[PDB]
Design a protein around this ligand. Structure first.
Ligand code: NDP
Ligand code: PLC
Ligand code: PLC
Ligand code: PLC
Ligand code: SF4
Ligand code: SF4
Ligand code: SF4
Ligand code: ZN
Lengths: 115, 139, 69, 111, 88, 175, 359, 124
């Protein structure tokens, strides 16, 4: 058995500081492959746009607190990196990943049906 | 079973007209004892040759010349052509037949790709009934 | 014991006449059949409380831990 | 296919045994009191695109009202034609009645 | 209880906020199910009268064993809930 | 401007041949459709238990080859696509890529319950409920699995549709 | 689109029918309407039909080509998309597609006359029969699509007949009818762009000097969708166009530069200076020898006429929609025809546009 | 006539016609259930525009083929046994008490019974 490209062992990290440095390198890894993600998936958005969306992704969830839940968030984000870099997700899924997305007053929701 | 000896015997017995019909849809000139026709018109034959293979001892000759549709086969005979019964539907004893209180009109095939195609619809009324407008004036 | 068996002991289409002797001279193994089934025999006629209870007495579920061990 | 008595009255009395057994949940039954009062059903739909031709239709009936004919050549151009309402099921029940007689009377001993 | 496990369960954002789960008892165990949607829970399909639905939690029921066990679960997932005490 | 459109002129599928050109372009349509009616080359897109029946048609008992049916693996060489078996969500994007690569004319046959409307796995979190959400379908074969004759019947009905094509007469009369 | 298109769940049409929408706006939801989209199998129809079906409106699509209607059924659910075989010369088949229809949309419009129809017979004769027949069946709303330069007195056959198409409808359907004028739309397989991408474009200088106001076809696709669900927009005239002005010759070199197409443009046939009589003669000769719709004499005149905005009409903002510019979408729609891909973003189209204008 | 076609009734005042495609069934006009949707209403849908109504499935109504059948009679007994009248391929056997003085239908077949004495009284 030979593990695939961009693989890491699943390890239960027992340090607060080490997890901080692991994440920081990971964020650079996404930015390094910014040009590739455009050329691999033929995305309509340019390289700067992907970095902008990646930053919006990394900025979004930086305030988590639980270390047992830090490793889980680092584990699955590693899988997202591994799936994307190995060119595993189809073209459509990446296009729709960035294509997702102010509310309305009570009268507006009352009339049509609300939820 | 496939050699020209069988084909020539089946060619001569059937005559040119019937055989040429088999040379247009069947692609295999075959002969056999006629066992009767259904309401639609298909003629159901059985072969008495000792050379035919196991599953080819019962066949049909459709009414059409250019196009053949399997659904034209009447359901009573359709079970006989499938080797599920030794008693042809025209030889049933009356204690076994189907007796219906409603008319049994001509057979109708499957009606896809034509305007006679079956259309599903909901047989149940809406479960909520709205209110009829009614006004009585101030006394 | 599944030893070799002649052609005429297998329910299959055979050879009638001199063609049988032609077949036995050309075919490498004369005791093999063509595999076509016998139309005259194969599928010729078509197909047309407590004393007796055990589930309630199923073996029980007992776990043995360090205390009982 | 939905069967029918020789006297003409529907065999089916709307158990909803049909809706319960169906592994693919392809049977939809709604029933009420008829005008004569005898218990019958006004809605009986099969989603032949959802059915698995399992056979629990035929086994569940205490009156042999729903049976599966030996027919297979009913492919349709539009998928809408594959939603069988009650009338389509009753049409087949009359259209295939004599054939179903062959099937049942040849499988009676083993049931 | 203090853990924001909703970021690992993968559930949609609407379960945390816009849905309410009832912890009831039908006679020895407790169950959890989600209260029905305001609109779009059940609309009659205009083709064949099928009971259509957009609620994806209508068919979900969780069989628990003890009350505090169910409450532990609801707090663990970050679920809004209320408890219905059975009548004696 | 000056315009006068009649009203009793019928539709194409009902319009009888009137002049000699209406017989010429009917000859071209039959000759061209007869070629596609006979050289019926589907694509081996077997996915699930429905795929066993699609093999048994090629078996010596039925011998699809006698009718001019030769399965071609590549989409380019295949003018039909028999979608047999469950179409999971993980497959649906891939199925569209295979379908879009078939040069025109192209037909799709949906065999079995899973390909038609979801089938047994209709309430599954990872099963497309009917392949008709992804690719247009020209004929639906019902079964689980449809018998080897049911698929042949479905093939025949689609053949009867192809022989009804009226493209080159449509240019003369409807275009 | 978003999640649910209807402004209110219950909408009463001009005919008194009370339609209640159900569901949260998914594929299995409904809106209770029945929008007959004439000419739905065309370029514009496949967008009009798609949006109507996904939100639950029954669509009756009358077609004359049998093999082109198959793909329209994917968009809707079971029974949502319906088909009627018809021809404009078969009046009875027209009345089959309007009997149950609460919305009737007209998209039929040609630029080339054939051996069976003239330009008038389609932009008028079809429109007149369609509009008048719809009224007799109590159709609540009619929506029509004409040229972007409709003019009754224009010397161009397309513009002259399209303008008369506006009059003849309003004398047949009545005050309720609506007229929408779309600018040249750009989308996948857009006839507006397919002329620019063609390598052998004889008379390329003459054809491409015309001016336009390109509009994104999706917005026009939603523009009819917004109008369809609203009764407030009866009896109006709408002209839909894009803010930033572009010309074909400006686009043709902009298009070619993205595809990077030294000696090649001079040889393959990109620039074919041909005499004006030859272009007029070539179009006439093919008009009797061709079998597929080619470049027409009418488009020789239209190349000399620039697009005109009519102030009596109403813009996108009248419907609450802001039109999108060709700059934000021109690259992706020619991305099929194009080391490291250079994605020409919205702003960078100007910098490309700068490079074209510089001598 | 837009009145009985959309109303449930015990019988039909008018004599039905086999060739009327607006009736609920060829042998009955008014529907035989309060919740059953009248056939005239259903066929007034979008999908029946070009589809031919002649070929649509119109099975004969059940509530008539039974009432044509004459009522069975029992002589010198007050318990009626009915098990489908077909052998072992019928409905489960049921016993019908004949104490009440009218025609009491079977549970499944819908067949009606009587006694010897009340034969003249019930037929009235
Ligand atoms: N961006 C654009 O495309 C432009 C839009 N417009 C106008 O908008 C309107 C929408 O047309 P569009 O879809 O964009 O382009 P198309 O020419 O492809 O649309 C033509 C539609 O109308 C049908 N049609 C044409 N002639 C007939 C006829 N005799 N009988 C029956 N049907 C006929 C066609 O049927 P079928 O295809 O099935 O044979 C098709 O459905 C047109 O009038 C167009 O001139 C104005 C300038 C350019
Ligand atoms: C060498 C070329 C030989 C062509 C052989 C194929 C025949 C064919 O394509 O025949 C098919 C076509 C059309 O069908 P049809 O039955 O005539 O349709 C008409 C049906 N009426 C007559 C009942 C209305 O016939 C022809 O147009 C005949 C002239 C061409 C020879
Ligand atoms: C030089 C080029 C290469 C060779 C060209 C030939 C290739 C094969 C052609 C296939 C034809 C085909 O398919 O004809 C067969 C199809 C099949 O009938 P159907 O489709 O069900 O319609 C027929 C039924 N109707 C019309 C009622 C719906 O029509 C025909 O029966 C056509 C009529 C028979 C024509 C006989 C007279 C003409 C003889 C011409 C030969 C001397
Ligand atoms: C190779 C030669 C092609 C001849 C085309 C032709 O004969 O076409 C001539 C005319 C034109 O009609 P169209 O091509 O449909 O016009 C629409 C296409 N336009 C807009 C590009 C012009 O039609 C006819 O009189 C057809 C008579 C049939 C002749 C036998 C073929
Ligand atoms: S045969 Fe089909 S419809 Fe009948 S119970 Fe089985 S799965 Fe359900
Ligand atoms: S089991 Fe028989 S009687 Fe009961 S609901 Fe099904 S078909 Fe009707
Ligand atoms: S329809 Fe039945 S046989 Fe076919 S793939 Fe699905 S489960 Fe298997
Ligand atoms: Zn009984």
């Amino acid at each position: 058995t030979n593990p695939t490209a961009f693989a890491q062992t699943t390890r239960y990290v027992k340090d607060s500081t080490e997890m901080r440095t692991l994440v920081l390198n990971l964020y650079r890894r996404y930015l390094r492959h910014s040009r590739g993600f455009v050329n691999n998936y033929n995305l309509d958005i340019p390289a700067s746009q992907v970095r902008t969306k990646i930053r919006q992704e990394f900025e979004r969830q930086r305030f988590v607190k639980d270390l047992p839940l830090k490793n889980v968030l680092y584990m699955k984000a590693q899988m997202e990196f591994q799936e994307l870099v190995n060119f595993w997700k189809q073209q459509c899924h990446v296009m729709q990943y960035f294509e997702s997305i102010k509310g309305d007053s009570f009268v507006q929701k009352f009339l049509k049906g609300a939820q | 079973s496939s050699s020209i000896q069988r084909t020539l015997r089946n060619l001569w017995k059937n005559g040119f007209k019937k055989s040429f019909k088999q040379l247009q849809g069947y692609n295999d000139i075959k002969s056999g004892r006629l066992v009767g026709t259904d309401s639609f018109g298909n003629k159901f034959y059985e072969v008495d040759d000792p050379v035919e293979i196991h599953m080819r001892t019962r066949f049909v000759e459709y009414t059409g010349f250019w196009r053949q549709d399997m659904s034209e086969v009447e359901p009573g005979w359709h079970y006989w052509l499938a080797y599920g019964t030794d008693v042809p539907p025209n030889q049933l004893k009356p204690e076994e037949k189907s007796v219906r209180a409603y008319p049994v009109k001509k057979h109708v095939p499957n009606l896809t790709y034509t305007d006679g195609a079956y259309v599903p619809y909901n047989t149940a009324r809406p479960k909520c009934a709205t209110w009829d407008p009614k006004v009585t004036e101030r006394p | 014991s599944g030893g070799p068996v002649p052609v005429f002991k297998k329910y299959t289409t055979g050879s009638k006449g001199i063609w049988e002797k032609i077949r036995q001279l050309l075919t490498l193994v004369p005791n093999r059949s063509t595999g076509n089934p016998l139309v005259k025999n194969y599928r010729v006629p078509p197909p047309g409380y407590y004393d007796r209870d055990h589930r309630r007495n199923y073996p029980r579920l007992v776990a043995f831990d360090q205390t009982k061990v | 296919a939905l069967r029918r008595y020789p006297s003409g009255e529907e065999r089916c009395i709307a158990c909803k045994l049909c809706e319960a057994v169906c592994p693919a949940q392809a049977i939809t039954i709604e029933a009420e009191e008829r005008i004569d009062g005898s218990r019958r059903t006004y809605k009986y739909d099969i989603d032949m695109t959802k059915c698995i031709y399992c056979g629990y239709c035929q086994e569940s009936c205490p009156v042999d009202a729903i049976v599966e004919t030996p027919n297979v050549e009913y492919a349709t151009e539009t998928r809408e034609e594959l939603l069988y309402n009650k009338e389509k099921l009753l049409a087949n029940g009359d259209k295939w009645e004599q054939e179903i007689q062959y099937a049942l009377d040849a499988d009676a001993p083993y049931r | 209880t203090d853990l924001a496990k909703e970021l690992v369960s993968g559930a949609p954002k609407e379960l945390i906020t816009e849905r309410v789960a009832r912890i009831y008892q039908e006679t020895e165990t407790w169950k959890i199910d989600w209260d029905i949607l305001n609109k779009g829970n059940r609309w009659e399909n205009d083709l064949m009268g099928y009971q259509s639905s957009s609620d994806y939690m209508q068919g979900t029921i969780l069989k628990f064993d003890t009350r505090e066990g169910a409450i532990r679960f609801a707090k663990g997932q970050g679920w809004d809930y209320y408890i219905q005490e059975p009548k004696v | 401007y000056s315009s006068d459109l009649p009203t009793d002129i019928p539709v194409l599928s009902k319009r009888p041949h009137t002049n000699l050109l209406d017989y010429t372009f009917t000859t071209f349509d039959k000759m061209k459709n007869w070629a596609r009616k006979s050289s019926f080359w589907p694509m081996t897109f077997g996915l699930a238990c429905c795929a066993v029946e699609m093999m048994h048609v090629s078996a010596p008992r039925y011998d699809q080859d006698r009718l001019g049916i030769i399965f071609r693996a590549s989409p380019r060489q295949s003018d039909i696509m028999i979608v047999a078996g469950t179409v999971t969500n993980k497959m649906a994007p891939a199925l569209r890529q295979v379908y879009d690569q078939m040069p025109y004319p192209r037909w799709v046959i949906s065999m079995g319950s899973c390909a038609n409307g979801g089938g047994y796995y209709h309430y599954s979190y990872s099963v497309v409920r009917g392949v008709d959400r992804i690719v247009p379908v020209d004929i639906y074969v019902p079964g689980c699995p449809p018998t080897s004759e049911a698929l042949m019947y479905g093939v025949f009905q689609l053949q009867k549709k192809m022989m009804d094509g009226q493209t080159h007469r449509m240019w003369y009369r409807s275009y | 689109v978003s999640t649910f298109p209807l402004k209110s769940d219950i909408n009463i049409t001009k005919s008194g029918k009370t339609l209640l929408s159900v569901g949260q706006g998914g594929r299995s939801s409904r809106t209770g309407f029945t929008a007959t989209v004439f000419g739905g199998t065309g370029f514009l129809g496949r967008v009009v039909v798609s949006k109507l079906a996904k939100h639950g409106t029954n669509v009756v699509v009358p077609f004359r080509n049998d093999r082109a209607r198959r793909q329209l059924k994917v968009n809707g659910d079971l029974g949502v998309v319906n088909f009627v075989e018809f021809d404009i010369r078969n009046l009875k088949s027209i009345e089959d597609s309007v009997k149950y229809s609460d919305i009737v949309i007209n998209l039929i419009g040609t630029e080339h006359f054939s051996k069976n129809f003239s330009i008038e017979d389609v932009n008028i004769g079809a429109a007149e029969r369609i509009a008048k027949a719809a009224k007799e069946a109590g159709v609540s709303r009619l929506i029509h699509v004409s040229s972007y330069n409709a003019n009754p007195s224009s010397s161009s056959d397309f513009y002259a007949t399209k303008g008369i198409g506006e009059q003849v409808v309003r004398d047949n359907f009545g005050p309720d009818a609506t007229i929408v004028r779309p600018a040249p739309m750009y989308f996948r397989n857009s006839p507006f762009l397919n002329e620019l991408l063609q390598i052998k474009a004889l008379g390329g200088n003459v054809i491409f000097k015309k001016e336009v106001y390109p509009v994104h076809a999706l917005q026009v696709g939603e523009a009819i969708e917004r109008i369809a669900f609203d009764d407030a927009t009866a009896g109006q005239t709408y002209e839909l166009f894009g803010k930033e002005r572009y010309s074909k010759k400006e686009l043709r070199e902009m298009i070619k530069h993205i595809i990077h197409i030294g000696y090649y443009p001079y040889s393959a046939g990109f620039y074919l200076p041909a005499p004006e009589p030859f272009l007029y003669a070539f179009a006439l000769i093919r008009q009797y020898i061709s079998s597929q719709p080619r470049f027409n004499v009418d488009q020789l005149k239209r190349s000399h006429i620039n697009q005109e905005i009519d102030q009596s009409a109403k813009t996108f903002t009248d419907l609450g929609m802001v039109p999108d510019e060709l700059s934000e979408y021109l690259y992706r729609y020619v991305k099929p025809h194009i080391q490291n891909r250079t994605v020409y973003s919205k702003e960078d189209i100007e910098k490309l546009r700068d490079y074209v204008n510089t001598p | 006539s837009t009145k009985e076609l959309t109303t449930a009734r015990i019988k039909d005042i008018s004599k039905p016609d086999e060739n009327n495609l607006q009736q609920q069934a060829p042998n009955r006009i008014s529907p035989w259930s309060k919740s059953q949707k009248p056939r005239a209403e259903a066929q007034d849908n979008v999908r029946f525009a070009v589809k031919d109504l002649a070929k649509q499935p119109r099975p004969y109504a059940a509530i008539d083929l039974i009432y044509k059948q004459p009522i069975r009679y029992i002589e010198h007994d007050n318990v009626a046994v009915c098990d489908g009248n077909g052998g072992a391929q019928g409905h489960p056997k049921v016993y019908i008490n004949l104490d009440q003085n009218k025609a009491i239908p079977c549970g499944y077949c819908g067949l009606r019974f009587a006694q010897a004495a009340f034969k003249e009284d019930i037929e009235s």
